[PDB]
């Protein structure tokens, strides 16, 4: 889970990338990119609380 900071830069946001590194005896490393389907019109969620 992630929370989006509530500042004006959110109006330009289009994706968040997540990378996970497993430190097992042989390390794993994979990334995911999550694209936002629309632009953020308000810096916070209108029903209360950060995005």
């Amino acid at each position: 889970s992630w929370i989006l900071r509530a500042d004006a830069s959110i109006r330009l946001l289009k994706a968040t990338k997540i990378c996970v590194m497993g430190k097992s005896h042989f390390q794993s490393y994979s990334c995911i990119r999550c694209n936002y389907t629309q632009a953020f019109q308000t810096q916070t969620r209108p029903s209360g609380g950060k995005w």
């Binding site: 308000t42 810096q43 916070t44 209108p46 029903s47 209360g48 609380g49």
Partner: protein, 213 residues
């Protein structure tokens, strides 16, 4: 300039429930002021100088805060409190208002009564057909209204309009208007309004057959 961010933008509270809404200033101010506005009339002064009640304001309302952080609290929600609340500052030029908190009154679920109206013959003479579907006295506002014409799902040719909360029972009413050219309307037979709502166990459909009498 000084921005007043109000949260939440929209909320509903049951009668008797405690209500808090916040006003956050982008920079520091000496006082915050709050106005109440109900549909179709002027805003009214409600709380001023951060915590003082305007004349006429019941003391279940209170205001608090300082610096950049302010709040308005209702100790026990009353139906007459449903309104939009605006905070406001004039510690620096320009004078600015907040973006507003719309407060509605929560109630138990109520299913809509669904009604359908075919186009009048008077309108068809002018060339267009408006088919009206009515959802009466329901809660909550959320509802799906899908039109089907000769079992063909429609999209992009209808508009919805929703009433204010009823003064007595706090329900909503909704109209959906499907508009077609006289040509396309007289080309089809079965016009159906399909309603999906939390108060209905299964979606309800009301229909008429074009060319019945």
């Amino acid at each position: 300039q000084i921005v007043l961010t109000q949260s939440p933008a929209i909320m509903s509270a049951s009668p008797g429930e405690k209500v808090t809404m916040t006003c956050s200033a982008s920079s520091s101010i000496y006082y915050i002021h709050w106005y109440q506005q109900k549909s179709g009339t002027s805003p009214k002064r409600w709380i001023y100088d951060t915590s003082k009640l305007a004349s006429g304001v019941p003391a279940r309302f209170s205001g608090s805060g300082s610096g950049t952080s302010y709040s308005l609290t209702i100790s026990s929600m009353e139906a007459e409190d449903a309104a939009t609340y605006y905070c406001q500052q004039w510690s620096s030029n320009p004078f600015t208002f907040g973006s507003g908190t719309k407060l509605e009154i929560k109630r138990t679920v109520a299913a809509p009564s669904v009604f359908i109206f075919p186009p009048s013959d008077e309108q068809l003479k002018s060339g267009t057909a408006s088919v009206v579907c009515l959802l009466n006295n329901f809660y909550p506002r959320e509802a799906k209204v899908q039109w089907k014409v000769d079992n063909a799902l429609q999209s992009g040719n209808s508009q919805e309009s929703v009433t204010e909360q009823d003064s007595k029972d706090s329900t909503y009413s909704l109209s959906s208007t499907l508009t077609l050219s006289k040509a396309d309307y007289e080309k089809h037979k079965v016009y159906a309004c399909e309603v999906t709502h939390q108060g209905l166990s299964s979606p309800v459909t009301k229909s008429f057959n074009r060319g019945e009498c």
